[PDB]
């Protein structure tokens, strides 16, 4: 008989091996405290509900919309704990494809590559809208508006809550508000990918764009992640939050969302979400975490400044000031594929061929050799 | 405009989780939960195993990072999984024909296998036993596959209709997937004998089926190595098969979502090519798997001493369920049940088809606060010497 696995096609590809001296690319204290508390107080591993820990959902909605939000008081939002932000995006995609007339999702160009594959996995067409002005390293707002002209009512338009991946360029509050007005007028269904809350300016300031939409819309979806702002990457801690016009509608929709989860992974992993709930619902433990998050934010910004300065010190004629204005861990360096290729093979400095760099991996000890490598390929 | 969510139809009730939520809300104190498969101790608790608590303490004091695992998870987790499934020194491991991905539970392993097949092969159909775990159909349909049923259970005699099983599976074509329960068939508890397994493997290789093994209860039938004999008979013959296994129950790690999806192909090149598409299907689902539960499982299986504590804990779970099965039958007789319940002794695992009708199951819940699945399936692992008497009284009252 012919083998089923014979007609399968290899998967195109998405360091670690090369032994060259000096190649260039931890758990939070609050998380360790939380885990200790769980080790000695947990008495069972019984299945969570399909939607996970209820307190995890309450604290998620408060982070997204603000304590006392009209969405919370009117009980218009339902939150399911999911395996990571990615898992939240997949659950939303399966829910939309199975239960609604949604067939088309619009994502920024450029964007996180996994957006298209997650929505495609549910049979949803993914279109791109304009976003990045590579000339000025700014948000091309005019082109963004123009390119969303063909997004029909009932289409999903995906927005990054803050720290746009990969450009690090976010709409201003006024741009957010303009987008919120336009979104209501054209009947779009907003979906926010909110994976870096707290890494731009702060917890509350980073949710301003989402809350501008939340104030205008009857319906929206938020796929949030705690992988980065809690350092809980491999524990897979995220949330998919549904918002509808009223309590009866969101509950009706949320039961089909839970049906989509049941047929995917059944119920979500507890450990990571318990940590987050333990921290968020404890005043002193939350104060510790919030300070760790502020520390992380300021360190990245500090490295952004040092990166720019050392590029100049080491003789770069190109102006990299735009790195200071960009938010989060990722910025487009502006290096060509041919310039990135050299860094990988000729300097042990590894970056994506698109020239995206990860400020997280920069330190005061590797900054000098790193910048000396970049100035060489310029 | 009109809201996108305005016309969504409410989802129907889950046959298992629908009753579970209802049990959580029940006001009566004597309520008894015989619904969802979860091991309980005689103290009325669903405890964490001691082996697990020790491993969790090790992780707490030694883990220095939470950085993403690979798409396929912890390497040592995959190797220990293949040892349990196929046995240390198997030809599949030495020939490097097997690739394992850590998944969120055995359910997640089923969906990953289903997505992988739906998106990378010509598979359109999955054959599932009648009866079977209710969520099998939901998992396969959501990935785009049809679900067909093949004969299995003799209700009147409480046995496995092996002849009806083979005849029904003649409608299955080459390239179609056939799902087999490794051990402790859900919900009947009736597993094929080794000779019956070897006949299915023989017949499977001939018809060209793609065996899919759901292996959620390894160790609860007779023993770790013994419970894998059916699978290993298929492995010795087939060039290709898939195994979705779970550690939720044999490690008591239900809510950490610890499972594995293992691909087996003819040679190392074919499995690696197929496995790259499995990882792609995983990337577009949950990206990478949760570490805590799998780290616990890997830590236990890799330490000889810690493994011994666990394998003794598992052994204590298996034979305590065996003691409840015997007590269940003996108490039914003492409480006035006239019919023969001896078939319950022959059944393996946590679950047993009690023969109760849908209406009788409804009565138990409303009038007696005893919660079973509408199929008549009962969770023997939820019975205790203390709740056995009231639950048997309730059952006899509705007979
Ligand atoms: C990292 C990232 C995600 C996924 O986060 P996880 O919780 O690890 O799944 C989603 N969207 C963006 C933009 C990201 O950068
Ligand atoms: C319980 C069960 C599962 C689910 O295993 P999880 O690890 O909880 O996802 C899968 N298959 C069968 C037959 C089961 O009984």
Author numbering:
A (entry chain A): -2 to 11, 20 to 30, 44 to 396
B (entry chain B): -2 to 396
Text from the published report:
E. coli aspartate aminotransferase (AAT) is a pyridoxal phosphate (PLP)-dependent enzyme that catalyses the reversible transamination of l-aspartate with α-ketoglutarate, yielding oxaloacetate and l-glutamate. During its catalytic cycle, AAT undergoes hinge movement to switch between an open conformation, in the ligand-free form, and a closed conformation upon association with substrates or inhibitors. Using our approach, we enrich the less populated but catalytically active closed conformation in order to increase catalytic efficiency (kcat/KM) with the non-native substrate l-phenylalanine, leading to altered substrate selectivity. Steady-state kinetics reveal kcat/KM increases of up to 100-fold towards this aromatic amino acid, resulting in a selectivity switch of up to 1900-fold, and structural analyses by room-temperature X-ray crystallography and multitemperature nuclear magnetic resonance (NMR) spectroscopy confirm that the conformational landscape is remodeled to favor the target state.
We collected X-ray diffraction data at room temperature (278 K) for all variants with the exception of AIFS, which could only be measured at cryogenic temperature (100 K) because we could only obtain small crystals that were not robust to radiation damage at non-cryogenic temperatures. To obtain structures in the absence of maleate, we applied a rigorous crystal soaking method to serially dilute and extract the inhibitor from the crystallized enzymes. Superposition of bound and unbound structures for each variant confirmed that closed library mutants VFIT and VFIY remained in the closed conformation in the inhibitor-free form, similar to HEX, while OpenLow variant VFCS and OpenHigh variant AIFS adopted the open conformation, similar to WT. AIFS is unique in that the electron density is especially weak in the regions corresponding to the helix formed by Pro12–Leu19 and the loop connecting moving and fixed domains (Leu31–Thr43), even at cryogenic temperatures, demonstrating that these structural segments are disordered when the enzyme adopts the open conformation. This result suggests that the four mutations of AIFS, three of which are found within the Leu31–Thr43 loop, contribute to destabilize the open conformation, consistent with the calculated Eopen value of this variant being >7 kcal mol–1 higher than that of the other variants that favor the open state (WT and VFCS). However, OpenHigh mutant AIFS gave rise to spectra that were distinct from those of all other variants, but could be deconvoluted to two exchanging peaks, to allow estimation of populations. We postulate that those peaks correspond to alternate open conformations distinct from the one sampled by the other variants.
